[PDB]
Structure 1
């Protein structure tokens, strides 16, 4: 029995069949179609710099309720517009309109985090300095 061929000269069939099947595995598909380059706002890169258009509070999904404090960013490298969450309690009032910002992914590999709908990106650095540093009061924002 068993669906596969077994014979000592099958080989080719085993190969081709495996290849065919591989396309149902999502990661593999992504790798091969190259959807990290063609689609996706970051050009298959770990980080991206963009310019802040405006500051937008986003209402969280259910069980929860709280205005999340995100930022609408337009990335420098391609010109694509994305929403980016600004972490920590203050921090939204470190950003301002027309400011250069360094965005990382959220930590779900393209997918949205937690309860914040349509947001796939963090804010790491504003005007060249780390948000965390600012928050902890280790450095100051050197204007814009």
Structure 2
């Protein structure tokens, strides 16, 4: 059983403190390892397109996901960022500013794309959605 005594407040508090480290979410929050991530705790980061690459999907699916290799500016960390919206790889060029965001699963890989948790959202200051919908044009 568990301790129930009126004078056992310290026992209960210390036990809860020690057991909270078993929870994955608690330990992810309070370990400090999220500051060693490429984004270092920020929702978005900017980076330089180093080279356009195509990485194969998982086993059941057969596709080339056509991501981008991005070197961040805040820390110089190289990441792979997915480019959604069919045809948007042609808006991506080497040595071009891009705003990266998370792939929506908090550093966990998403879908059939292995090892990618980052998507390109903005290129050269123009959103990829605007370029897909032809609402704006990429500056020369």
Whether TM exceeds 0.5 here: the answer is yes
Pairwise CA distance, 1:62: 1.1
Quote the residue 2:133 is aligned against. 136
* C-alpha separation in 1, matches of 2:33 and 2:101: 18
- Which of residues 18, 21, 25 is equivalent to 1:20? 18
Task: Using structure 2 for the length normalisation, give the TM-score.
Answer: 0.98
Unaligned runs of 5+ in 2: none
Quote the residue 1:116 is aligned against. 113
* C-alpha separation in 2, matches of 1:32 and 1:90: 41
Pairwise CA distance, 1:130: 0.1
Pairwise CA distance, 1:31: 1.5
Quote the residue 2:84 is aligned against. 87
SS at match of 1:137: coil
Task: Using structure 1 for the length normalisation, give the TM-score.
Answer: 0.95
Number of residue pairs the alignment of both structures matches? 140
* C-alpha separation in 2, matches of 1:76 and 1:83: 14
**Partner deviation per Cα, 1:69-113 (whole Å, 9 max, x = no partner):** 100000000011000000011100001000010000001111001
* C-alpha separation in 2, matches of 1:51 and 1:109: 22
Pairwise CA distance, 1:36: 1.3
1:64 aligns to 2:61 (yes or no): yes
SS at match of 1:54: strand
- Which of residues 119, 122, 125 is equivalent to 1:125? 122
1:49 aligns to 2:46 (yes or no): yes
Indicate the RMSD between aligned Cα atoms, in angstroms.
0.7
